[PDB]
Every structure is written in C-alpha cells, then in structure tokens.
Structure 1
Amino acid sequence: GPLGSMTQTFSSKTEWRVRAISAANLHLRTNHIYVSSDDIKETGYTYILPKNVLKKFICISDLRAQIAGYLYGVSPPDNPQVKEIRCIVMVPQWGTHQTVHLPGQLPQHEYLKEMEPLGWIHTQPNESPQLSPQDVTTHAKIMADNPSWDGEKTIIITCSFTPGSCTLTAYKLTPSGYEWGRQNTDKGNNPKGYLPSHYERVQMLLSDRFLGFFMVPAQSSWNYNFMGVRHDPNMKYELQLANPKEFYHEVHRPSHFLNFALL
C-alpha cells in the first residue's frame, strides 16, 4: 500500500516509432522472396512480376498497416497466355492490418493506355492458406464499378511477411466469388456467405529479364496512414512517372515535424 512511499510517473512510448525502426530494415527481406507454386494446371494466365518493383514495393511498406499497388501490363509479342506486369501504380491510400482503403477512381494517365489492368498487389502481416474475404470483397466491388477489370484476367497478389522474408501468392476470383463479394457488407473476419471456391490460385513467376516502373500521385504522395482524415473514398488524383517514397518518409507525417517544432 504505497500512495506516498512509492511514486512513479508515466513516460510516453509511442508505437509508430517502433514500427518505423522496424520498417527501416525491410530491405533485408528482399533478398529472400519466395513464391508459392501450388497451382499446377497453367490453364489460367501466367503472371510475371519483375523483381525491381517488387523489391521497391516491399521497401516502401509497413509491417502492420497494409499497402496496395495497382498492376498494369501486357502479354509478350507472341505468347498471349503470359501476362507481364510492367507497372505498379501507387494511389492515395490508407490501411489496417486486415485491409486497404483506396479511392473509387482507378489510375488514369496517358502512359497506361497501352497496358491492361491486371489487378493489384498488397502486403499482409501473416501468411494465410486462403485469400481473405476482405480481399474477395475489394476485388469484386472494383470489378462491379470498373468493367475494364476482366474477372478472368485480373489477379490479387499477396505479399506476406514471413520470418526474414516474403512469400508471394497470386489469386483470381471465380464467378461465384465475384457475385458474393459484390453484395458483401459485413467485412468482419467471417461474413455471411463466404466460401473457399470463391477464388483460385494463378501461376506467378518473379523475373530479372525486364524491369517494371512506378507511377505515383502528381500532387500528394500515396501514404495517408498519418492523415486518414484527409483521405476520402471519392478523392480524385493524377499520376506522374516517379518512384514512391517509403512508408515513414517525412512527407507522409509532416505533423510529427511541425508539432515537435512547436513543443
């Protein structure tokens, strides 16, 4: 019983700083990237992901809050069943450990008009056997709103942080999963009606043979996880040909600098 003999005082211990020290070391994981290859048939398309933009995507991410990129690409001159991923587009976004939050507006720029959309890629805190129902809902709603997203051609690549490394698995929606994700409003962990036959693995290879590139917003940066207020599902944005800053860069958290200066 010490109200007076023993007195202690709380000292702040903010979490984003531990996550920032953690994200400084993401580059170690880019020398240990693995792809799941449990899909066997090759009946679907084969998706080739250039390592350069993969590694940059990993480097700009966070270990807890998910980030997403849009995939754009084409089939090689004589091989229509192969989809080369040529561009990853970063749009104003914010996220949690389970999902990402994107604007309704898909990328629009002159440089992308000769490519076709191939879906999206997102980081994940832990490896999973199945595609998330959040992901099935996200992909299905994007498809219902944007007809340029062929369900038989657009994929979800998941990039899971496994110890010391990164595991990549690629999925697509099946018709049943499209029709379920469209109407799904419970985005808990197990919503009504969710099914494993709603998605399927698509084959996916990492390549060193060609290089991808990034496009990023023209006025802002992409990371709004420190500004989630100023993010609006209807926000409009343009794009430029430039490489994205990393998660905890100064331009993503200007209040940490101005508010410390005020003290």
Structure 2
Amino acid sequence: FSSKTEWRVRAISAANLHLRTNHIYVSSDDIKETGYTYILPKNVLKKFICISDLRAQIAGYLYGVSPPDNPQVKEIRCIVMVPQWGTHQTVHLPGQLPQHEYLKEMEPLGWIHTQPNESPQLSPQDVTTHAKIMADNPSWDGEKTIIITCSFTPGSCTLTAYKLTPSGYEWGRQNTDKGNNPKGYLPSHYERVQMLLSDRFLGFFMVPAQSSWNYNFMGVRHDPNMKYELQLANPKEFYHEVHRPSHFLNFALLQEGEVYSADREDLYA
C-alpha cells in the first residue's frame, strides 16, 4: 500500500463497515450430525466485522463453552484479539496462546478471521495455521477447534466454518512455504461444518492489557517471539489513532508560526 494514498482510500472505506453487518450470509450445507454445531453471538460478529478491513485480514480467537447436558453445541462466548499484523492474504499472530483466568472458564474453540476475497474453500494459510498451532499447543483439540472465514462480499458478509481431517492437520504441519498454491495442498485437508448465529446470548471482547491488536502498520514491534498480556477491553477500530502513532507524531513546523496574523479576538468564556 502507498502508505499515504492507500492509507486514506481504505480509511474512508472503513467509515461505514457497519453497513455490512445487517447483511451476513450463513454457511448452510450437509451436516455431519455427529460433530458439533458452533453458535456465535450476532453483536460480537458485528464488532469483529466492523473492526476489520476489506483487504487486510484479521483473526480472532474463539473462547466459549459447551452447555451442560447439551454437548454437541459449542457456545462462542468470547473472542480474543492478540497483537498482530496481517497481510491482505492472511493473518500473522504470535505463537503465545491467550491465557487468562477469564479464559480459564472456557475451552479454545479455534480461530476465525476476516477475508477480503470470496473463496469457497479453506485458505491454504488457514489450514496450515490451524495445523501449526496444533503442532506446538495440544490445548486445541481436533474434534473441538474450527477455522472460520468471513468474507466481505459486495456490501455484505459471507462466512463459513471448517474443520480439518487427519491428513489435513498432517499436511498442514508438513508445509512451510507461504504461497496460496502449496504442493500437496488439496481439498482433502478440511471439512466444513455447522456454524450458527446467536442473538441468544452475549459474547465479550478481549484486548491486550498493554497494547493493540493491529500491528498491521508497525512492521517493527511485531515478532513471533514478542510477548503480550490481555484484558476484557474493546478492540478499537482498525485505524484508530493508537495503532497509527507515527503520522499523529508527524508535525513539522517552527513554533513561532503564530507570528503571522496576530489579531486576537476571543471575548468568550
């Protein structure tokens, strides 16, 4: 991005992203009936969407529960934002898993993300990402963790939620290269499953206790070895002045600029 012009054109894009979130589309296809069905609050999908970009992908982490004596439904009752920068193609979010006494009450449901372009398959990045998380953290369980995409379609949203097959997780932790066309990447690696919306309960938001989630514009402070805290606070919008300190720190004058036109009428307050 041009860093000045692509800066504004997408900032004035972003100013009405809430337009979409009364136009989302739900993933309806053949059901497994033996797996889970993952139910998400409408308003946190709202916020998770309006905070995003329509080219830069962001990802959130689902925390939530199973209800007592109703196992195979997965309530998504909280979403965590971690520090990250994403590309327009995927999301890059550090290896540190969000831990909390808040996140104690819940099991990690997996990961969900924005998507600019409509793609009726799992993004290779997504499959290898869930894999690579499986590779170092047994906290996620294969029968329990899923990969959501939510594309920004023409003024609308269209979301789907997938789960990996065994060879799916296998090839994912196999792959290293970062092209959308990794050899040995095939539609054998995922399975799309039942996700539902909810006005039925309330999800809540998680934000780092000290920092942001959109290091998108600071390619400097984000490192796969960097570490972060968390809190229940609201993700501020993609471009809010916290995540853009350089240009808000871009001021170049010589301070006696007040020399010119010194007629000084106030008379008020």
TM-score interval for Structure 1 and Structure 2 normalised by the shorter chain: over 0.9
Give the whole-Å Cα distance in 1 for the aligned partners of 2:34 and 2:155. 33
- Aligned residue for 2:215, secondary structure, equals coil
Q: 1:21 to 1:172 in 2, by over 3 A?
A: same
CA RMSD of aligned residues (A): 1.9
Q: 1:262 to 1:115 in 2, by over 3 A?
A: farther
Structure 1 stretches of 4+ moved >3 Å: 10-13, 260-263
Q: CA deviation at 1:208?
A: 0.3
Is the Cα–Cα contact under 8 Å of residues 92 and 222 in structure 1 kept in the other structure? yes
Q: TM-score, normalised by structure 1?
A: 0.93
Q: CA deviation at 1:102?
A: 0.6
Q: 1:13 to 1:103 in 2, by over 3 A?
A: closer
- Aligned residue for 2:168, secondary structure, equals helix
Give the whole-Å Cα distance in 1 for the aligned partners of 2:30 and 2:229. 37
Give the whole-Å Cα distance in 2 for the aligned partners of 1:33 and 1:87. 20
Give the whole-Å Cα distance in 1 for the aligned partners of 2:161 and 2:100. 26
Q: TM-score, normalised by structure 2?
A: 0.91
Q: CA deviation at 1:221?
A: 1.2
- Count of residue correspondences: 254
Give the whole-Å Cα distance in 1 for the aligned partners of 2:133 and 2:252. 42
Aligned-pair identity in percent equals: 100
Q: CA deviation at 1:43?
A: 2.0
Q: 1:126 to 1:18 in 2, by over 3 A?
A: same
Give the whole-Å Cα distance in 1 for the aligned partners of 2:154 and 2:81. 26
How big is each residue's C-alpha offset from its partner over 1:103-141, in whole Å with a ceiling of 9 and x where there is no partner?
110001111111000001100011211101111111100
Counterpart pick for 1:63 among 30, 54, 75: 54
- Aligned residue for 2:98, secondary structure, equals coil
Q: CA deviation at 1:235?
A: 1.1
Give the whole-Å Cα distance in 2 for the aligned partners of 1:49 and 1:173. 20
Q: CA deviation at 1:19?
A: 0.4
Is the Cα–Cα contact under 8 Å of residues 186 and 192 in structure 1 kept in the other structure? no
How big is each residue's C-alpha offset from its partner over 1:124-170, in whole Å with a ceiling of 9 and x where there is no partner?
01121110111111110001110011111100111101112101100
Q: CA deviation at 1:188?
A: 0.5
Q: Counterpart of 1:7? A: none
Give the whole-Å Cα distance in 2 for the aligned partners of 1:54 and 1:236. 26
How big is each residue's C-alpha offset from its partner over 1:70-111, in whole Å with a ceiling of 9 and x where there is no partner?
001111122110000011000001111111101110001111
Q: 1:58 to 1:12 in 2, by over 3 A?
A: closer
Q: CA deviation at 1:11?
A: 12
Give the whole-Å Cα distance in 1 for the aligned partners of 2:3 and 2:42. 40
Give the whole-Å Cα distance in 2 for the aligned partners of 1:40 and 1:175. 19
Q: CA deviation at 1:261?
A: 5.2
How big is each residue's C-alpha offset from its partner over 1:213-238, in whole Å with a ceiling of 9 and x where there is no partner?
01110111111011121101111111
Q: 1:174 to 1:17 in 2, by over 3 A?
A: same
Give the whole-Å Cα distance in 2 for the aligned partners of 1:150 and 1:191. 25
Give the whole-Å Cα distance in 2 for the aligned partners of 1:100 and 1:155. 16
Q: 1:157 to 1:258 in 2, by over 3 A?
A: same
- Note the residue ranges of structure 2 that are not aligned, 5 or more in a row: 255-269
Q: 1:132 to 1:12 in 2, by over 3 A?
A: closer
